[PDB]
């Protein structure tokens, strides 16, 4: 069984089946499939000028164009961009940048980065260490610490979500104080944890994280691997949650996955420090594969000029979120129905009233995912969390089509749970 | 000044000036500039099918085609390939593979990798730690380093062959110091690239290999620069006559036209990793299809247009002879060296004394600036001057490049004298 074609939100196979890609490839095909204009952009750039050379003191014009456009859509203060080939490379570079920044400041001890259990930051040795996947962890490398994730369903006890957000953020303060602030370089997090299961923190979480980072002279880093380029309805997830990172990382969402690329966006304060040190100046000037940059430029231009991101914020996001909640909330073994913009999720649970999870977390998720897949719907299981992140161009009719298939699948899921004595 | 055009071995700028690219971009534009056929391959693959979803349990056909072609040009037994987006990612993945291999074998202590001072293995935290560049230093735990086989500096009263045995024995000494049961692998570039085209003696790699096998340590070649025909063989380890357990490749796989890299995994390590399962997803689903389509066109050209064979049989030996003929006579040039289409020399204060200039790098920069003013790109690595032009360079282009370089060296010698530095 082989894939033949993609268009919009659909994939087709050699047997003629139409498949709804409810995950937009690897959470990244934000403009959808079938952009022949991107192929033309790549073709043109490769025929004309696919290289630049450091012999010249100038930046390749395709990269200049991309950076200029990016500046218009990123938050204030992020004019300095260091391009990479992937989100994993972006995270790795960010780690080195954070540590070098503190060296330049005359604080060589300030080297520990803090992440979270169930956080994911790619697959380099550095990124895997900063991530908090139990299986991935030798690992972690030195100068890496972790705090618990803001997963209310599991850790909330009898706290309201807002109370819990403050408590979960204060775990960062506890860890900083345990290590000593003089040894802590940065806190890094995905605005919404992606691979961990679309863990959406309470509204009080990020502002308290930021208060803590600022109090203790710790840098704040957003990993926009999944939340970037319109996924939440804002251009970047940190904008939705209302925090101001000092740097943020981006992955191939920058090109909707059509060519490999990533970036580190470096805010004014950290950029000034890095440039004083000099170690990243070559990359600030010369980074960025020009062919990948031309495609990324076409992608970002489409996201803005075709109204795609604005439509997530104003139209399809709120529609998806309401329809998602209307569809899944009634099921006996579905809880914590959640989402923002065009990322959404729920958790398969043994007992909603008790907030009791199934044992062997992941086994039931796999069972449900297999039902979706049999019905030609791609949604992903992260443990027993079911997640979705379709192309942002999905229409209201396509949302409703996807939800109708998922609804049918959940009916079968509930029936199967019962039949197997697992309900 | 902005770059406007490249074709073959040349770049052009907005003033109409022709620049000789004696470094093939980042040591990687092996088929040369102006391959509009590669643009068509990218266009076709991106229009037809730039994605392949894991929902299908099959590999994208572009990637299958690339792997099938690669198997024809790699040595026997490299039946598993893990694609990445760069040489840096390849090195990082290789480190994780080596360590996981020994875990699967039930030797969880066997985790230290040994590299070399002045070795370069990319810019991830892992790769920077395995590399031995004094400024980059990190290192993360489980990384150790031995001295580089740089005879001009470290050879004392030994011949190069004698020195190669001693420099390789440094690996045995390090293994014994650490304890062999803690050592996972030795990693090296067949010729150190960024370190200055340090070409080891003929006795070196065979001894390194003997030592690795004696102590049950894996042997890894980093083919970042030597890969895809640079020495006249497809891979540098072939030229030097050793058989690594895995090797890493960078964007030379596509002549740099799109970002890509790979880890080529031999039978022993692949069978161990597959038993573990950790890399199976990558072995099956890795490789961006568009980049793979371009890499396929590149590798096909390197083979079918006879480019690699021509380096071995024809243009390589011509370059090497002409390079030595051109530079050997200069008072402040020594250790003229190279193989295939990578070559170098070192600027020195006194050849008879093997005396280097102080502040190693300052004189290299002076010489490099002269080349650049004369529209010739060759790189300085400290006071080493290095060259790695596109493999398609003709004899006329070799001689054109050398004549410019020769004129530049005459100016260099005059400038040294004038500045009181000779
Ligand atoms: C900074 C980054 C490396 C370059 C890629 C690199 C560039 C050259 C080098 O630094 O060795 C490569 O091609 O291997 C990137 O795009 O991110 C990383 O390793 O994290
Ligand atoms: C294994 C590698 C990462 C992937 C790239 C990665 C793939 C997805 C992931 O592993 O998170 C990315 O796109 O960020 C690679 O091509 O090498 C590395 O970290 O060295």
From TrEMBL, chain A:
It comes from the Bacteria. The keyword tRNA-binding does not apply. Its cofactor is pyridoxal 5'-phosphate. It is an enzyme of class 2 (transferase). SUPFAM superfamilies: PLP-dependent transferases (SSF53383). The modification N6-(pyridoxal phosphate)lysine (covalent) is found at residue 252. Pyridoxal 5'-phosphate binds at residues 87-88, 285. One of its GO terms (molecular function) is identical protein binding. Keywords: Aminotransferase, Pyridoxal phosphate, Transferase. GO terms for cellular component: cytosol. InterPro entries: Aminotrans_3 (IPR005814), Aminotrans_3_PPA_site (IPR049704), PyrdxlP-dep_Trfase (IPR015424), PyrdxlP-dep_Trfase_major (IPR015421), PyrdxlP-dep_Trfase_small (IPR015422). Its EC number is 2.6.1.62. The keyword Transferase applies. Belongs to the class-III pyridoxal-phosphate-dependent aminotransferase family. PANTHER family: AMINOTRANSFERASE (PTHR43094), AMINOTRANSFERASE CLASS-III (PTHR43094:SF1). This is Probable aminotransferase. The lineage of its organism: Bacteria, Pseudomonadati, Pseudomonadota, Betaproteobacteria, Neisseriales.
From TrEMBL, chain B:
It comes from the Bacteria. Its EC number is 2.6.1.62. InterPro entries: Aminotrans_3 (IPR005814), Aminotrans_3_PPA_site (IPR049704), PyrdxlP-dep_Trfase (IPR015424), PyrdxlP-dep_Trfase_major (IPR015421), PyrdxlP-dep_Trfase_small (IPR015422). It is an enzyme of class 2 (transferase). Transmembrane segments: none annotated. The keyword Transferase applies. The keyword Transmembrane helix does not apply. GO terms for molecular function: adenosylmethionine-8-amino-7-oxononanoate transaminase activity; identical protein binding; pyridoxal phosphate binding. GO terms for cellular component: cytosol. Coiled coil: none annotated. Its cofactor is pyridoxal 5'-phosphate. Pyridoxal 5'-phosphate binds at residues 87-88, 284. NCBIfam families: PRK07480.1. Belongs to the class-III pyridoxal-phosphate-dependent aminotransferase family. This is Probable aminotransferase. It comes from Chromobacterium violaceum (strain ATCC 12472 / DSM 30191 / JCM 1249 / CCUG 213 / NBRC 12614 / NCIMB 9131 / NCTC 9757 / MK).
């Amino acid at each position: 069984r082989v894939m033949t074609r993609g268009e919009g939100v659909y994939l087709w196979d050699s047997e003629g089946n139409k498949i709804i890609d409810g995950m937009a490839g690897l959470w990244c095909v934000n403009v959808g499939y079938g952009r022949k204009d991107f192929a033309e952009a790549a073709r043109r750039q490769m025929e004309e000028l696919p290289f630049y050379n450091t012999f010249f003191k100038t930046t390749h014009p395709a990269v200049v164009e991309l950076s200029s456009l990016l500046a218009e859509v990123t938050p204030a203060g992020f004019d300095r961009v260091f391009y990479t080939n992937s989100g994993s490379e972006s995270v790795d570079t960010m780690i080195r940048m954070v540590r070098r920044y503190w060296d330049v400041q005359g604080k060589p001890e300030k080297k520990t980065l803090i992440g979270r259990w169930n956080g994911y930051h790619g697959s380099t040795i550095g990124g895997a260490s900063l991530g908090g996947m139990k299986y991935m962890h030798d690992l972690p490398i030195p100068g890496m610490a972790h705090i618990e994730q803001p997963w209310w369903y599991k850790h909330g006890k009898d706290m309201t979500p807002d109370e819990f957000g403050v408590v979960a953020a204060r775990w960062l303060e506890e860890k900083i104080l345990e290590i000593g602030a003089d040894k802590v370089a940065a806190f890094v997090g995905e605005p919404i944890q992606g691979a961990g299961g679309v863990i959406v923190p309470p509204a009080t979480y990020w502002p308290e994280i930021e208060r803590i980072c600022r109090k203790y002279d710790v840098l704040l880093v957003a990993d926009e691997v999944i939340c970037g380029f319109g996924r939440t309805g804002e251009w970047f997830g940190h904008q939705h949650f209302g925090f101001q990172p000092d740097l943020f990382t981006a992955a191939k969402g920058l090109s909707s996955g059509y060519l490999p690329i990533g970036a580190v966006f470096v805010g004014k304060r950290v950029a000034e420090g890095l440039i004083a040190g000099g170690d990243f100046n070559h990359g600030f000037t010369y980074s960025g594969h020009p062919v990948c940059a031309a495609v990324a430029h076409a992608n970002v231009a489409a996201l803005r000029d075709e109204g795609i991101v604005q439509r997530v914020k104003d139209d399809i996001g709120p529609y998806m979120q309401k329809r998602w909640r209307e569809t899944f909330s009634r099921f006996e073994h579905v809880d914590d129905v959640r989402g923002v913009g065009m990322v959404q999720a729920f958790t398969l649970v043994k007992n909603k009233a008790k907030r009791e999870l199934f044992p062997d977390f992941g086994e039931i998720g796999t069972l449900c995912r297999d039902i979706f897949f049999r019905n030609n719907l791609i949604m992903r299981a992260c443990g027993d969390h079911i997640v979705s992140a379709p192309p942002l161009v999905m229409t209201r009719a396509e949302v409703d089509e996807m939800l109708a298939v998922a609804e049918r699948c959940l009916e079968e899921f509930e029936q199967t749970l019962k039949a197997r004595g697992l309900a």
